[PDB]
Design a protein around this nucleic acid. Sequence first.
DNA 1: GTAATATTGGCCAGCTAGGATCACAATCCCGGTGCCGAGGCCGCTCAATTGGTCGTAGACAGCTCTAGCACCGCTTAAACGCACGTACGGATTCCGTACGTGCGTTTAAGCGGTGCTAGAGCTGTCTACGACCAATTGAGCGGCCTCGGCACCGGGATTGTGATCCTAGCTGGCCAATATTAC
DNA 2: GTAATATTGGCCAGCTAGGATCACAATCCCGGTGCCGAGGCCGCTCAATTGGTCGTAGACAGCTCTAGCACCGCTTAAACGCACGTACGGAATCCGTACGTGCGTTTAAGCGGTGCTAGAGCTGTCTACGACCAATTGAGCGGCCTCGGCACCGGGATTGTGATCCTAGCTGGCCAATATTAC
Lengths: 95, 95, 82, 85, 109, 109, 98, 98, 71
Amino acid sequence: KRSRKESYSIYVYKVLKQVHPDTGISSKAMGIMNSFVNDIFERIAGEASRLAHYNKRSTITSREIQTAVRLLLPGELAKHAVSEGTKAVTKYTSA
Amino acid sequence: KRSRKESYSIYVYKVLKQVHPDTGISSKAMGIMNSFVNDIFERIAGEASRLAHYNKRSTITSREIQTAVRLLLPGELAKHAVSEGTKAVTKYTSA
Amino acid sequence: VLRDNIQGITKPAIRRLARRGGVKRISGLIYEETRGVLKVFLENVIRDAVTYTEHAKRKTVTAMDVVYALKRQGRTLYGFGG
Amino acid sequence: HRKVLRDNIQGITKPAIRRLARRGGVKRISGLIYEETRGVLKVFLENVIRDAVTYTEHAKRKTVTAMDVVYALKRQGRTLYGFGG
Amino acid sequence: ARAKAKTRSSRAGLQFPVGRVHRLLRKGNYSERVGAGAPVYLAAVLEYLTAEILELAGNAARDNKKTRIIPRHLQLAIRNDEELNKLLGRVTIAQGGVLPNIQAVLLPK
Amino acid sequence: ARAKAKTRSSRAGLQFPVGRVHRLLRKGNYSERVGAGAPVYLAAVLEYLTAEILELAGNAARDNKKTRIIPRHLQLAIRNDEELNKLLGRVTIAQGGVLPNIQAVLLPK
Amino acid sequence: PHRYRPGTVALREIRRYQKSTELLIRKLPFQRLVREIAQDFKTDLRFQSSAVMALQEACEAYLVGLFEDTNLCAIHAKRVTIMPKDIQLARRIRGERA
Amino acid sequence: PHRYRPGTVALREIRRYQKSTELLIRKLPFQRLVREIAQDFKTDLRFQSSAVMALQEACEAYLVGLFEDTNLCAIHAKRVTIMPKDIQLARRIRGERA
Amino acid sequence: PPVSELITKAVAASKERSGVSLAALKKALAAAGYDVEKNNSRIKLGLKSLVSKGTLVQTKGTGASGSFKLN
DNA sequence: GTAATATTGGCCAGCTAGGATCACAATCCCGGTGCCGAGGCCGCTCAATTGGTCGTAGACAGCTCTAGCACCGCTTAAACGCACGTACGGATTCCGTACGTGCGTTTAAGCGGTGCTAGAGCTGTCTACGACCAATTGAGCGGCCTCGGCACCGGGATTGTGATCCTAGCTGGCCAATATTAC
DNA sequence: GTAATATTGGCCAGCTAGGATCACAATCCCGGTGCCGAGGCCGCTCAATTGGTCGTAGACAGCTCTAGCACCGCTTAAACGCACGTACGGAATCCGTACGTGCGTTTAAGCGGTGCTAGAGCTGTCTACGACCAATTGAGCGGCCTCGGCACCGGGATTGTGATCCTAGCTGGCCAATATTAC
């Protein structure tokens, strides 16, 4: 009939072909990557939501995401993630 | 001017006079009890909400509370907390 | 009914776990201690899993229930669909 | 207005570490513990103050309030009751 | 035409506020909808924890001949109870101090 | 009268789904309202983490002469990176195993 | 007559079981044990195979990390052998009741 | 001539500082130090007094728990003295990078 | 110099109610300039045999462990 | 066969321990004091309550078929028990010195106080932004096919380990030389 | 003093450490092979998109005033430095045996194959319940007041520690009682 499981697999495959065109991915590892993305997602989204209420703000915006990212990732990871994310949001705003 | 903060103090004082009529509570301790209650509340409410979505349930009910209580509190504490809570909900339903 | 299968976690299995942990020499009392430790861990994890199950008015414990039990314990397990 | 408050880590003096340690039950302490503990303390503080200043910046405030510190600790899973948590 | 006011907490035979907890579950954005028995059960649970804590803390203070409980008494109550010290084990109490705990080997012979 | 379809992810120059993440922030009932730049920024962040991980894992697999990454490679990538091992430090990886780590004193002389 | 001196084959098998990923606990005893634990909380409970495999996967990771910390405790003692006192210490410091 | 043998007054001050609750870090050095740390992340930052007091209360609880675990590590060695190796071990086992 | 002749001269260096310690013999023979590093087992046999002769005596410990006296 | 010498057990004396005594510091305790925080009271307000409506989440029943369970039989790797031995843990001893403890000296915290003001906090305005909706549609899911990656097998190669032997060196003993003893 | 003997030095034999070599087995590497899972294709669907509306969240300016900051000047209390010394850590040694290693035997894990049912998951119905609104009201908040618990202290009382003195138990030497050797 109609049963729906949610994953990020194809997006992970896209990223992988962007970084390592000559490399494959085991279905086991794609279930791990799917779980990893969902976990990181859940942490960041929980911190951003939790932060907004803690700040008496009712909305999640680029600021709340920026501070949750800056919060959760340590050092050099945060600096680069923040950098590319700002670049991307700028491009999206321009579009 | 009128500024309102939130606390449980009077309720804590009521409980205290129910259990220890001849005992006082310092405002330092009433600020810790207030923080106490809010932290336990945040854990239980977060687990109950989190559990309902993880069960594809859109509502927090006595069931959701019962399993979060049973889940957080360890052993003899949970058994008694569950017991009095069931007693209280029954009384409320009867009323 | 099942009884006394905690001995099922046999001596060589403990030996191999330790070895995967970098252990070289092992005193003979480690085996009972580790069986007890392991018994403790499982009874917490299984308590949480059966609880999540009961809550769903369900009578089978899914892998997702196990994942959430560990995830609550702060020992999130990837790979099982979590 | 804005003092340059450098070299201050040594302000956590030997006897202060003695009395904290003593509150922890230790009886005899080797003279090298002091530098190790100062390093530990700078690390702990770095992490906490980073998280706190972050929670602050988000609010657009330029003052770090106690609510920010308790949220930072609570975020590091070291929740502290008594300061408005 | 209007019935005499009867607080939900009095309808449940409690001291904790049912309306405030109800508000906090809805205004916490925990769930878009909240059942009716959830706030009652939750207030009762918070009631039990505070009563347990306050019983133990009052015991500690009277044991220390203090007629009024203070944070040290809370730290004593918590750390001297096993299941509470388990629930609040990762918790640091303001002005709590530590249990008197000298490891035996440290005492002189 | 209708413009040619342009996916938000293509409007951002990404591969991760902006619509799906948008859906998840709104459906997960994190907040009643969600800004427009939040899902974009979030998808980019998830993109960066997955690309970092996959770069490291592919390096590990090629180092192991493996043309395809498998969970052991993920465990190697994670545990061999300091900041990742910090982010996922409390994490247990399926079929990951452990880093080869023999403490020096254990080697014979 | 040939006999490897004690400790050599042990290091070989260390290198081996660290290079490897196979589950180390025998599957059927661990499943039966899981059933023994669950039986105490409720009777007539059914387990998906993936769920039991998850418990096994998790137990192996937990004990391996525990043995990492334990071996560190033992080596700190300047004792190559691990003994139960090492386990109670490693656990007490992990913060779990012990 | 009177001189308490080493270890006795130490035990008395242990009983004392465990009976007591006063903050043990001197307030002004700790506040100046906090400002030192914050200055690195951003300049011209202002601290409410309650916030600095919170950092101090938390630091004292963290170091006290660390010394609890460290003393346990030292006693396990059968060494009454604590040394830095004990600290790196206690921290590595707490899971914090060390 | 061959061993068993410097050990006598070393134990002759002291009178102690429970004998000269092994640590003293190590330090004294090092002070004589001898390779106590590499010849340690030769030293242990020389000492144990020479106390076994009764020319020296072992008075606490056992073997090279503990303490020693002259005849 | 008998006696003197020597041997063995006991006593007196000496040495070392354990118990009792003393003197001082720390803790506590009993009682007085004031002081301030806990606790109570007051008229205010918004949040709690009540009641009625809508719709929709979810309880419930019924059907499907996945998958969990049970059971059998075989083969075999893993487990077990035992023999054996080395390396380890642990007990003992000893030593040097890093700690601790107790002085005087120095510092800066702490307190109280004053003065200044950045910035927290609140209010009002308003609009950009996000929710909602219907109509549109194409990316994403499931099913199917396939072919290349790789696990396995076997032979050859390499590495690591333990066991063994050889040689140079040193120590111990014999014969000769020198130092000592005798002529 | 000189020569012979007995002690010591030189030569030879025996023992050990280091170096070298061999034996052998675990690991690696390499080909081939066949399996099967990754990856692509197709078709179908519903979630993403677009554009428009509408409400309001929050950006922004402006004002109040709290609270943070800065400086000053005494007052101790704490930090500091140093002298002295002892308990500790740590090195070294040794012994006993607990665990590793290896072998032969036993067991049951694993596979796989079959059969069966209960329970997993879905759909459809229908309805109790909760959101919501409007009107009502009293519990809770802040402000004032107030007074008893408690911190502090001053002065005794009790306890703990460190050091010393005496009585005692144990061990050693000589004497008493007894076997061994010489006459």
